[PDB]
Design a protein around this motif. Sequence first.
Motif, PDB file in Angstrom:
ATOM      1  N   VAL A   1      25.918  -5.582 -35.078  1.00 41.59           N
ATOM      2  CA  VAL A   1      25.536  -6.926 -34.646  1.00 41.59           C
ATOM      3  C   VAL A   1      24.547  -7.550 -35.626  1.00 41.59           C
ATOM      4  O   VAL A   1      24.621  -8.751 -35.931  1.00 41.59           O
ATOM      5  CB  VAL A   1      24.959  -6.865 -33.214  1.00 41.59           C
ATOM      6  CG1 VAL A   1      24.111  -8.100 -32.889  1.00 41.59           C
ATOM      7  CG2 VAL A   1      26.075  -6.658 -32.179  1.00 41.59           C
ATOM      8  N   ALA A   2      23.617  -6.745 -36.143  1.00 44.81           N
ATOM      9  CA  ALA A   2      22.595  -7.256 -37.051  1.00 44.81           C
ATOM     10  C   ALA A   2      23.186  -7.880 -38.316  1.00 44.81           C
ATOM     11  O   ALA A   2      22.539  -8.741 -38.921  1.00 44.81           O
ATOM     12  CB  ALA A   2      21.615  -6.139 -37.426  1.00 44.81           C
ATOM     13  N   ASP A   3      24.394  -7.483 -38.733  1.00 46.86           N
ATOM     14  CA  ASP A   3      25.018  -8.194 -39.849  1.00 46.86           C
ATOM     15  C   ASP A   3      25.242  -9.673 -39.545  1.00 46.86           C
ATOM     16  O   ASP A   3      25.355 -10.477 -40.477  1.00 46.86           O
ATOM     17  CB  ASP A   3      26.355  -7.554 -40.232  1.00 46.86           C
ATOM     18  CG  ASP A   3      26.190  -6.227 -40.967  1.00 46.86           C
ATOM     19  OD1 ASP A   3      25.040  -5.776 -41.140  1.00 46.86           O
ATOM     20  OD2 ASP A   3      27.213  -5.635 -41.377  1.00 46.86           O
ATOM     21  N   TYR A   4      25.303 -10.056 -38.270  1.00 47.32           N
ATOM     22  CA  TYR A   4      25.583 -11.436 -37.896  1.00 47.32           C
ATOM     23  C   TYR A   4      24.427 -12.124 -37.189  1.00 47.32           C
ATOM     24  O   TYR A   4      24.274 -13.337 -37.329  1.00 47.32           O
ATOM     25  CB  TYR A   4      26.847 -11.484 -37.027  1.00 47.32           C
ATOM     26  CG  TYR A   4      27.995 -10.716 -37.672  1.00 47.32           C
ATOM     27  CD1 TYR A   4      28.786 -11.303 -38.650  1.00 47.32           C
ATOM     28  CD2 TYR A   4      28.270  -9.401 -37.313  1.00 47.32           C
ATOM     29  CE1 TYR A   4      29.829 -10.604 -39.244  1.00 47.32           C
ATOM     30  CE2 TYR A   4      29.304  -8.693 -37.904  1.00 47.32           C
ATOM     31  CZ  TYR A   4      30.080  -9.298 -38.872  1.00 47.32           C
ATOM     32  OH  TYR A   4      31.121  -8.598 -39.455  1.00 47.32           O
ATOM     33  N   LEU A   5      23.588 -11.379 -36.464  1.00 48.15           N
ATOM     34  CA  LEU A   5      22.334 -11.882 -35.908  1.00 48.15           C
ATOM     35  C   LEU A   5      21.195 -11.151 -36.605  1.00 48.15           C
ATOM     36  O   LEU A   5      20.707 -10.124 -36.102  1.00 48.15           O
ATOM     37  CB  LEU A   5      22.291 -11.675 -34.400  1.00 48.15           C
ATOM     38  CG  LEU A   5      23.466 -12.361 -33.703  1.00 48.15           C
ATOM     39  CD1 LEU A   5      23.414 -12.036 -32.239  1.00 48.15           C
ATOM     40  CD2 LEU A   5      23.395 -13.873 -33.946  1.00 48.15           C
ATOM     41  N   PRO A   6      20.732 -11.644 -37.760  1.00 47.99           N
ATOM     42  CA  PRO A   6      19.831 -10.828 -38.589  1.00 47.99           C
ATOM     43  C   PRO A   6      18.449 -10.628 -37.997  1.00 47.99           C
ATOM     44  O   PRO A   6      17.774  -9.676 -38.404  1.00 47.99           O
ATOM     45  CB  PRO A   6      19.775 -11.594 -39.923  1.00 47.99           C
ATOM     46  CG  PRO A   6      20.150 -12.994 -39.587  1.00 47.99           C
ATOM     47  CD  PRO A   6      21.066 -12.936 -38.386  1.00 47.99           C
ATOM     48  N   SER A   7      18.001 -11.464 -37.048  1.00 47.24           N
ATOM     49  CA  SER A   7      16.725 -11.179 -36.389  1.00 47.24           C
ATOM     50  C   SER A   7      16.781  -9.913 -35.545  1.00 47.24           C
ATOM     51  O   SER A   7      15.751  -9.486 -35.010  1.00 47.24           O
ATOM     52  CB  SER A   7      16.287 -12.350 -35.499  1.00 47.24           C
ATOM     53  OG  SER A   7      17.087 -12.436 -34.323  1.00 47.24           O
ATOM     54  N   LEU A   8      17.958  -9.324 -35.388  1.00 42.88           N
ATOM     55  CA  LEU A   8      18.120  -8.134 -34.573  1.00 42.88           C
ATOM     56  C   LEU A   8      18.186  -6.868 -35.410  1.00 42.88           C
ATOM     57  O   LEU A   8      18.441  -5.795 -34.858  1.00 42.88           O
ATOM     58  CB  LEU A   8      19.369  -8.265 -33.704  1.00 42.88           C
ATOM     59  CG  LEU A   8      19.304  -9.368 -32.641  1.00 42.88           C
ATOM     60  CD1 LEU A   8      20.585  -9.367 -31.816  1.00 42.88           C
ATOM     61  CD2 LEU A   8      18.082  -9.188 -31.743  1.00 42.88           C
ATOM     62  N   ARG A   9      17.967  -6.968 -36.726  1.00 40.48           N
ATOM     63  CA  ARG A   9      18.013  -5.782 -37.569  1.00 40.48           C
ATOM     64  C   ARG A   9      16.890  -4.833 -37.175  1.00 40.48           C
ATOM     65  O   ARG A   9      15.752  -5.255 -36.962  1.00 40.48           O
ATOM     66  CB  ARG A   9      17.900  -6.162 -39.049  1.00 40.48           C
ATOM     67  CG  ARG A   9      18.247  -5.023 -40.026  1.00 40.48           C
ATOM     68  CD  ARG A   9      17.669  -5.305 -41.414  1.00 40.48           C
ATOM     69  NE  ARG A   9      17.631  -6.748 -41.622  1.00 40.48           N
ATOM     70  CZ  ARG A   9      16.819  -7.380 -42.458  1.00 40.48           C
ATOM     71  NH1 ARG A   9      15.976  -6.718 -43.243  1.00 40.48           N
ATOM     72  NH2 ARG A   9      16.847  -8.713 -42.499  1.00 40.48           N
ATOM     73  N   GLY A  10      17.217  -3.551 -37.052  1.00 41.87           N
ATOM     74  CA  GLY A  10      16.246  -2.541 -36.688  1.00 41.87           C
ATOM     75  C   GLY A  10      16.107  -2.298 -35.202  1.00 41.87           C
ATOM     76  O   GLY A  10      15.505  -1.296 -34.807  1.00 41.87           O
TER      77      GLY A  10
END
Length: 351
Positions: free
Chosen positions: A81-90
Amino acid sequence: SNAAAAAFESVIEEHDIPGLVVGVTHGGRHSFYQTGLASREDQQPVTPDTLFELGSISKIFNVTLAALAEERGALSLDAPVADYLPSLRGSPAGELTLIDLATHHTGGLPLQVPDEVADVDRLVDWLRSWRPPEPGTRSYSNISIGLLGHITAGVLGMSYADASQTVIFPALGLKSTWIDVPTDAMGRYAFGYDRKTDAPTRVTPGVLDDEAYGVKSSARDMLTLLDLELGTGTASPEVQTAVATTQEGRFQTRLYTQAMIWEAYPWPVDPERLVEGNGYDFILQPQPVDEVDTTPDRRVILNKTGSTNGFGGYIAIVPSEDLGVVVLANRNYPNEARVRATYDLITHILA
């Protein structure tokens, strides 16, 4: 030619279903059984062209669009998901994959968007600090399937409404399927009838409503969809492949194999297993899953319930029998009743 009437006569009276339609596709031959009124006040009858609220059955279109987006290279269902919603990385949410969203493999989410979340941006913030209580379990939720539709639409450069109405619905050959029903079709839009108050009702707006439960369709259009799901429709190689991608076995629960929204049981089945698999004890709590690449049996039945406040729907397909059934009612009535009556109708057809 009277099998659907006998199969549903009991549930119609036990729950005072004002209107109901049953479309059957078998070997390419379409048939419909229609009874009652789409609207009590002006006495408009149900027809194969009456529009009903599909509820969670909308999620079928969602995952097909995601699979069609994968067929085109716009995204990969294995990416996080983080590839598309980058504030969710980690974060745990950003490390879910798109496949996890399509199969509810999230570790535990509330069924509904929380009351306190006002829009999809706020929901992304909420997901950033979310922690799954039971990592790796299946947890049925509008939040995860809704987010996938938001991601897919973002990758296509348009609203999820425009992705549905200008990409996936035309690709599937549908002509009476809408997120936003247009003026000329509003006369066909059935009223729902509330279980408690018997008052007319229509789906109300909500966060991720388009992406998770905002589709309206007719029995006739749904049979077009089921012919495509049976593998016997007219579509490009893209869409034929996307449809098949959505039925692949992804996770095994105690009662069935989880595909993308589709839930696949062995064929033949004990109907009691179909009932429990669609029961609340299973739907509303996290369930352990085993990963697997296919269903245990090569002959399966795939089904999906769908409800709003005023509507109760159900679709099932048996591909080894080229059989598809859609049941649409403008009363929300129990999942167990939809399953048993539809299973009864199927046995009669194949007898």
